[PDB]
With several copies, the nearest count.
Chain A
Amino acid sequence: EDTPQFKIDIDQEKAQALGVSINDINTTLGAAWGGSYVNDFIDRGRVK
């Protein structure tokens, strides 16, 4: 069934006025709340 979800509108005019990139907003929101797979590292000789 459908559930409550948190709708957030990014005001384009306000962002352009303050000089805030939309890519920086989307990345900041996505990375913080959703998570971002940056790159790989080696944990005891295995790529992760």
Chain B
Amino acid sequence: SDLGKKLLEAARAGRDDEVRILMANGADVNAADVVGWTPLHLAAYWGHLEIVEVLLKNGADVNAYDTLGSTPLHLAAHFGHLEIVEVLLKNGADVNAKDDNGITPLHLAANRGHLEIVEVLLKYGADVNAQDKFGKTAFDISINNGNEDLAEILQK
């Protein structure tokens, strides 16, 4: 698609006004680059709250996965975008979503030490005993990084 590739650029750039005009013209919201990132992936990555809401209103797949199985919730959680994590979870984002490595939004949130997002994810029913390909939980990450605050939050 022509407009699909303009929407990917718009969503990434954070050009709220251009995304508005694209949704009206009917730019493909399920458009994906070579790595398989939708506008929602990009919007979630770069932290554009307004565009995430607009794309979800225009039937964007909240549980869309890239070629390595990562979702917008993975990206939003990892890069510490609290507002976007809540919006995604309210629109029915899979909280226990595993990538190809068995990594979850909780794992990524725990690794960068995002306390608010960890509690938001746990509130929406994030499996705290969820293990990756190396058999590591969000708790195993917290004690290894030496995060006492996060270690106290993660008592099942």
What is the interface of chain A, defined by CB distance below 8 A to chain B? 4, 11, 13-14
Interface assignment of B37: CB less than 8 Å from any CB of chain A = yes
Q: Chain B's interface: helix, strand, loop or mixed, by majority?
A: loop
Number of A-B contacts (CB under 8 A): 7
Question: Which of the residues B33, B34, B35, B134 comes within 8 Å of A11, measured between beta carbons?
Answer: B134
Cβ contacts under 8 Å, B35 to chain A: 4
Considering the complex, which residues of chain B in the window 1-54 have a beta carbon less than 8 Å from any beta carbon of chain A? 33-35, 37
* Chain B residues bordering chain A, tally (CB within 8 A): 5
- B134-A4 in contact (CB<8A): no
Cβ contacts under 8 Å, B37 to chain A: 4
What is the interface of chain B, defined by CB distance below 8 A to chain A? 33-35, 37, 134
Can you spell out 7 A-B residue pairs with CB atoms less than 8 angstroms apart? Answer: A4-B33, A4-B34, A4-B35, A4-B37, A11-B134, A13-B134, A14-B134
Cβ contacts under 8 Å, B34 to chain A: 4
Q: Kindly report which residue of chain A lies nearest to residue B35, judged by CB atoms.
A: A4
Cβ contacts under 8 Å, A4 to chain B: 33-35, 37
Cβ contacts under 8 Å, B33 to chain A: 4
Q: Kindly report which residue of chain B lies nearest to residue A7, judged by CB atoms.
A: B68
> Would you give the shortest CB distance from B96 to chain A, in whole angstroms?
21
Q: Kindly report which residue of chain B lies nearest to residue A14, judged by CB atoms.
A: B134
> Would you give the shortest CB distance from A13 to chain B, in whole angstroms?
7
Which one of A4, A11, A13, A14 has the highest number of Cβ atoms from chain B below 10 Å of its Cβ? A4
> Would you give the shortest CB distance from A18 to chain B, in whole angstroms?
12
Cβ contacts under 8 Å, A14 to chain B: 134
Q: Kindly report which residue of chain B lies nearest to residue A5, judged by CB atoms.
A: B35
> Would you give the shortest CB distance from B44 to chain A, in whole angstroms?
15
Q: Kindly report which residue of chain A lies nearest to residue B46, judged by CB atoms.
A: A2
Cβ contacts under 8 Å, A13 to chain B: 134
> Would you give the shortest CB distance from B6 to chain A, in whole angstroms?
14
Q: Kindly report which residue of chain A lies nearest to residue B68, judged by CB atoms.
A: A6
> Would you give the shortest CB distance from A10 to chain B, in whole angstroms?
11
